[PDB]
Design an enzyme around this catalytic site. Structure first.
Site, PDB file in Angstrom:
ATOM      1  N   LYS A   3      28.800  43.579  41.052  1.00 24.42           N
ATOM      2  CA  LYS A   3      28.970  43.150  42.158  1.00 24.42           C
ATOM      3  C   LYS A   3      27.664  43.085  43.173  1.00 24.42           C
ATOM      4  O   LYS A   3      27.335  44.643  42.945  1.00 24.42           O
ATOM      5  CB  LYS A   3      30.041  43.821  43.135  1.00 24.42           C
ATOM      6  CG  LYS A   3      31.186  42.955  42.603  1.00 24.42           C
ATOM      7  CD  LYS A   3      31.998  41.967  44.040  1.00 24.42           C
ATOM      8  CE  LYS A   3      32.876  41.881  44.607  1.00 24.42           C
ATOM      9  NZ  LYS A   3      32.222  43.254  45.782  1.00 24.42           N
TER      10      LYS A   3
ATOM     11  N   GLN B 250      38.202  40.686  37.255  1.00 22.63           N
ATOM     12  CA  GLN B 250      38.517  40.538  38.757  1.00 22.63           C
ATOM     13  C   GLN B 250      37.914  39.399  38.547  1.00 22.63           C
ATOM     14  O   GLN B 250      37.516  39.043  37.578  1.00 22.63           O
ATOM     15  CB  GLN B 250      38.120  42.382  39.325  1.00 22.63           C
ATOM     16  CG  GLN B 250      39.356  43.330  39.566  1.00 22.63           C
ATOM     17  CD  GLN B 250      38.233  44.046  40.738  1.00 22.63           C
ATOM     18  OE1 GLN B 250      38.011  43.778  41.618  1.00 22.63           O
ATOM     19  NE2 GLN B 250      39.109  45.187  41.491  1.00 22.63           N
ATOM     20  N   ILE B 251      38.446  38.966  39.685  1.00 22.13           N
ATOM     21  CA  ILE B 251      37.451  37.587  40.288  1.00 22.13           C
ATOM     22  C   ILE B 251      36.939  36.884  41.634  1.00 22.13           C
ATOM     23  O   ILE B 251      36.977  38.021  42.265  1.00 22.13           O
ATOM     24  CB  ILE B 251      38.433  36.170  39.935  1.00 22.13           C
ATOM     25  CG1 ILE B 251      39.399  36.688  40.780  1.00 22.13           C
ATOM     26  CG2 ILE B 251      39.307  35.840  38.787  1.00 22.13           C
ATOM     27  CD1 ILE B 251      40.840  35.285  41.345  1.00 22.13           C
ATOM     28  N   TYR B 252      35.368  36.916  41.013  1.00 23.48           N
ATOM     29  CA  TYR B 252      35.278  37.015  42.369  1.00 23.48           C
ATOM     30  C   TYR B 252      33.682  35.915  42.429  1.00 23.48           C
ATOM     31  O   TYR B 252      33.641  34.940  41.676  1.00 23.48           O
ATOM     32  CB  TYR B 252      33.658  38.425  42.116  1.00 23.48           C
ATOM     33  CG  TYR B 252      34.201  39.425  41.933  1.00 23.48           C
ATOM     34  CD1 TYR B 252      35.096  40.023  42.862  1.00 23.48           C
ATOM     35  CD2 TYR B 252      34.145  39.996  40.507  1.00 23.48           C
ATOM     36  CE1 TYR B 252      35.468  41.151  42.779  1.00 23.48           C
ATOM     37  CE2 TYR B 252      34.864  41.026  40.435  1.00 23.48           C
ATOM     38  CZ  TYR B 252      35.528  41.656  41.750  1.00 23.48           C
ATOM     39  OH  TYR B 252      35.662  43.235  41.276  1.00 23.48           O
TER      40      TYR B 252
END
Ligand SMILES: NC(=O)c1ccc[n+]([C@@H]2O[C@H](COP(=O)([O-])OP(=O)(O)OC[C@H]3O[C@@H](n4cnc5c(N)ncnc54)[C@H](OP(=O)(O)O)[C@@H]3O)[C@@H](O)[C@H]2O)c1
Ligand SMILES: NC(=O)c1ccc[n+]([C@@H]2O[C@H](COP(=O)([O-])OP(=O)(O)OC[C@H]3O[C@@H](n4cnc5c(N)ncnc54)[C@H](OP(=O)(O)O)[C@@H]3O)[C@@H](O)[C@H]2O)c1
Ligand SMILES: NC(=O)c1ccc[n+]([C@@H]2O[C@H](COP(=O)([O-])OP(=O)(O)OC[C@H]3O[C@@H](n4cnc5c(N)ncnc54)[C@H](OP(=O)(O)O)[C@@H]3O)[C@@H](O)[C@H]2O)c1
Ligand SMILES: NC(=O)c1ccc[n+]([C@@H]2O[C@H](COP(=O)([O-])OP(=O)(O)OC[C@H]3O[C@@H](n4cnc5c(N)ncnc54)[C@H](OP(=O)(O)O)[C@@H]3O)[C@@H](O)[C@H]2O)c1
Lengths: 58, 58, 58, 58
Positions: A12, A47-49
């Protein structure tokens, strides 16, 4: 046309941290190019982004 | 070899509820066949689940 | 000092949608006032958001 | 009556891994005693789990 491929190591760029391998992909109107990323610190958790939130690292 | 395809309408079989369209896919050792599912009640929000947690509905 | 209390009905103001009751609270440096919100459409599923992302509705 | 308090270091007992500090709490019918846990590896990212999924570590 995809920015990342399976197994790329990404993190991220800002805000909450996340770092690990690309393990998947998703597409919605809000997020037309999104990725699933499995943490390299917490195996199994994913997690998804959106693509804009992520950058590839070596 | 995939159980679901993009745009299938699915729901969680048990526990916390979730229902909407398949919008993506992911693969880890813990979850070798997983899906991203965009809620049909809350546009834009996506959750990810193992294939065993989901069932297709019409 | 809290903006919302347990059982307030709230929704996400923008981006991915979410709407339901406040069921909890969390505090980090990034998000010093955050809430857990149980969907009123998908019982059992809970998401967590900063206070700035949420607004109360009747 | 709470099993953990703010700042306890906990980890997920099984399946997907997660480890860090208790930063919050939530309550639903499915999960009448749940916790928010900020990763000690990925600052800022928080996940939420039922008390039965977690154990305290020193
Ligand atoms: N990504 C995942 O798959 C996943 C899974 C489980 C948990 N989480 C948790 O979500 C968190 C991610 O934190 P983050 O720093 O990326 O985001 P954040 O600070 O938790 O913000 C959450 C979301 O709420 C909206 N938001 C935040 N501030 C806003 C503001 N001032 N005005 C309007 N909307 C605002 C944005 O939602 P919109 O996106 O709707 O604009 C943002 O993406 C972590 O704690 C993480 O572990 C993420
Ligand atoms: N799926 C997503 O993408 C996503 C994203 C954001 C938020 N969430 C939130 O996660 C929740 C999903 O709830 P749920 O009913 O599916 O699961 P849950 O009751 O919240 O349980 C969470 C996870 O903890 C573990 N667990 C639960 N009970 C356990 C026990 N007795 N012993 C050992 N481990 C236990 C399992 O983790 P393991 O998987 O490690 O075994 C389970 O998948 C919803 O509130 C949802 O909105 C999910
Ligand atoms: N909130 C939860 O508890 C939870 C749980 C499971 C799943 N989810 C899933 O997360 C999604 C929430 O979507 P959303 O619209 O709120 O956020 P989003 O569009 O999925 O964005 C995700 C996060 O990535 C960062 N981000 C997004 N665009 C960015 C950009 N252009 N530049 C830099 N960073 C950017 C922000 O992360 P930072 O926060 O790090 O800035 C944002 O909060 C839903 O699909 C939801 O179901 C949320
Ligand atoms: N906890 C959070 O806050 C959060 C936030 C964002 C993302 N996530 C992501 O969610 C994942 C957690 O993985 P995990 O190992 O705990 O759970 P998992 O293997 O992803 O399973 C997800 C959930 O689906 C249900 N499920 C799984 N296998 C099932 C089966 N055989 N039959 C029926 N239902 C089944 C359970 O849902 P029910 O709970 O409905 O029974 C389980 O909690 C991680 O990848 C994590 O990062 C979690």
């Amino acid at each position: 046309n995809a920015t990342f491929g399976m197994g790329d190591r990404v993190r991220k760029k800002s805000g909450a941290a996340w770092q690990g391998q690309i393990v998947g992909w998703y597409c919605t109107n809000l997020t037309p190019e999104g990725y699933a990323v499995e943490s390299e610190a917490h195996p199994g958790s994913v997690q998804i982004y959106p693509v804009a939130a992520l950058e590839r690292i070596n």
